[PDB]
Amino acid sequence: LPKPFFFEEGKRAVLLLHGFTGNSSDVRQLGRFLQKKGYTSYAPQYEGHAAPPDEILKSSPFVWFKDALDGYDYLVEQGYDEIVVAGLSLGGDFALKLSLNRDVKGIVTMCAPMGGKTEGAIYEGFLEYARNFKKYEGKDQETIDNEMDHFKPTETLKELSEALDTIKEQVDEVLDPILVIQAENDNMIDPQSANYIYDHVDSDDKNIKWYSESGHVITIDKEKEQVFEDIYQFLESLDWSE
Numbered sequence: 001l002p003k004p005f006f007f008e009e010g011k012r013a014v015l016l017l018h019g020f021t022g023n024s025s026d027v028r029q030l031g032r033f034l035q036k037k038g039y040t041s042y043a044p045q046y047e048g049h050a051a052p053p054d055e056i057l058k059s060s061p062f063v064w065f066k067d068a069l070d071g072y073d074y075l076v077e078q079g080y081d082e083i084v085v086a087g088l089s090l091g092g093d094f095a096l097k098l099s100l101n102r103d104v105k106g107i108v109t110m111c112a113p114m115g116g117k118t119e120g121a122i123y124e125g126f127l128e129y130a131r132n133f134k135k136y137e138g139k140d141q142e143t144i145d146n147e148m149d150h151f152k153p154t155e156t157l158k159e160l161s162e163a164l165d166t167i168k169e170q171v172d173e174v175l176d177p178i179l180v181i182q183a184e185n186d187n188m189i190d191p192q193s194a195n196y197i198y199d200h201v202d203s204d205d206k207n208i209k210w211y212s213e214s215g216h217v218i219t220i221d222k223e224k225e226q227v228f229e230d231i232y233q234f235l236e237s238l239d240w241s242e
């Protein structure tokens, strides 16, 4: 089961945030790519994640945001003033909100949703997350159905819906340079969310890129090297002190 990572190179640092029911391995290759370019990167994990799915149900999205803020403060503790935040799916929503609470050099959202519509796509996915996990646990097929009929996700998925709506009303306060990344054929979020973000931030420096062959977990799909390179292009265009 995955764990956070910290790759120390130069003085320019990137904070990487994963998605709902994801973990650090979703952003690890991107961490290795940035390291080879000389960027330091740090990837925390939210509470309940990289763990049995019941742990998520005992948690709250409002904890998960603090895990992101603690990520930023950790980088600063370790000696890094100048930090870009880059976030995947839900993590992309957190990156937007984090920029309103800490000094960042820039923002990168990757397939970040706009709107707390948790029905349909988000619902079945939490269910499948527990299916393949209860399978990973080595549970017979008769068992997997038993604790599944005892899985109540309505609580957790509803705090998630409020949290997202709050952040949607906040996009108009974002000011820092931004790169919006969105997969064209997304089955999980509404890909029009990327247009909502690009059009409504108050940034003076913004950019949107579309990928025509990837899925929602874009950092591990077939076009990922292209996505890494466009992120690098963005980072090099900011005003690092060094």
Ligand SMILES: [Ca+2]
Binding pocket: 078
């Ligand atoms: Ca250290």
Ligand SMILES: [Ca+2]
Binding pocket: 169, 170, 171, 172, 173
């Ligand atoms: Ca507002």
Ligand SMILES: [Ca+2]
Binding pocket: 202
């Ligand atoms: Ca303006």
Ligand SMILES: [Ca+2]
Binding pocket: 205, 206, 207, 237
């Ligand atoms: Ca730009």
